[PDB]
Design a protein around this ligand. Structure first.
Ligand SMILES: C[C@](O)(CO)[C@H](O)COP(=O)(O)OP(=O)(O)OC[C@H]1O[C@@H](n2ccc(N)nc2=O)[C@H](O)[C@@H]1O
Length: 301
């Protein structure tokens, strides 16, 4: 019967700051990160149906599974189970977060499914239950629910919200192929065995520049301890980082293990010109402008 539909908009993210602790056993690394949600988004529409189904549209959407191995599918199952229900829902995802872009689009979709089902079934399970479900689903789901900018400590503990005085303007560029996050951690571990790569300061100055809304202040503090390793596995990333800056960006970094390179610019006009130049210059398959921070998963219907 029921018939209505709920759509939830949810953003991709970039890492403005990433410190990576020394390898533990069993083999993991403790991460400290400043997450920043930006205006490349997916929209996820959920309706009552006879059985659970999932469909995706948008560039690259045809690469993605539409069964259990999709995190948005797992989210519906977990959300339904949480409230003792069958996940009798159909899910349609309009994808504009670049696929395999390293912006955590799968985790964004999972978070949007939680929020959408909450509203469609008129439940209001509390935000803290959604966060607990997000954490079972995978380590980037919680931030997709939180959005804006947050500091995360990698310990299962609560994200710390950071507010910004003004909006920031980015160019995001995506390589034609990503790297295995496994390969990047191994290469990080190796470079730390044979040399002394860049160790970042603690994140307080990043937070203070974000708070000030000041891109000239934030630009030189952007940092990623995985970057030297990504750049050792894919040396073109170094030229690409230079081109973005030559094109007029304040600074660029690789986000996470890649493929995103994120370039902070001084303004919307400036981001449009840097993006036009980069796109013209051929270093990257895809170039897009975005702003941040933007909100996490929210109903927009
Ligand atoms: C969350 C990220 O660390 C960065 O966005 C990555 O997406 C990695 O997450 P993941 O691949 O789901 O993590 P797992 O499935 O447990 O294992 C992937 C491999 O990446 C390495 N890895 C991942 C996370 C982490 N904090 N430290 C680890 O060194 C692990 O050695 C692991 O063998």
């Amino acid at each position: 019967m029921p018939t209505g539909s709920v759509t939830v908009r949810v953003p991709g993210k970039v890492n403005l700051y990433l410190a990576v602790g020394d390898r533990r056993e069993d083999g993991y690394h403790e991460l400290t990160t400043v997450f920043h949600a930006v205006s490349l988004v997916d929209e996820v529409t959920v309706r009552n149906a006879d059985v659970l189904s999932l469909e995706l549209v948008g560039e690259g959407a045809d690469q993605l599974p539409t069964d259990e191995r999709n995190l948005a599918w797992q989210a519906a199952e977990l959300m339904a189970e949480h409230v003792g229900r069958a996940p009798d829902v159909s899910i349609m995802i309009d994808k504009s977060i670049p696929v395999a872009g390293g912006m955590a689009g799968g985790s964004a979709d999972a978070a949007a499914v939680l929020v959408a089902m909450n509203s469609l079934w008129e439940l209001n399970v509390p935000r803290r239950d959604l966060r607990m479900l997000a954490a079972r689903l995978g380590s980037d789901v919680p931030f997709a629910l939180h959005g804006g900018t947050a500091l995360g400590t990698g310990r299962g503990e609560e994200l710390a919200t950071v507010l910004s005085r003004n909006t920031f303007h980015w160019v995001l560029a995506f390589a034609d192929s990503g790297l295995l996050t496994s390969a990047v951690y191994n290469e990080l571990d190796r470079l730390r065995e044979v040399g002394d790569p860049p160790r970042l300061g603690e994140p307080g100055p990043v937070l203070a520049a974000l708070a000030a809304g000041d891109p000239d202040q934030l630009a030189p503090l952007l940092g990623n301890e995985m970057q030297a390793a990504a750049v050792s596995l894919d040396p073109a990333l170094a030229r690409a980082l230079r081109a973005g800056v030559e094109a007029g960006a304040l600074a660029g970094i690789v986000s996470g293990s890649g493929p995103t390179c994120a370039f902070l610019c001084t303004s919307a006009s400036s981001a449009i010109d840097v993006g036009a130049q980069l796109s013209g210059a051929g270093v990257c398959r895809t170039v897009r402008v975005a702003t941040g921070p933007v909100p996490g998963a929210r109903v927009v219907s």
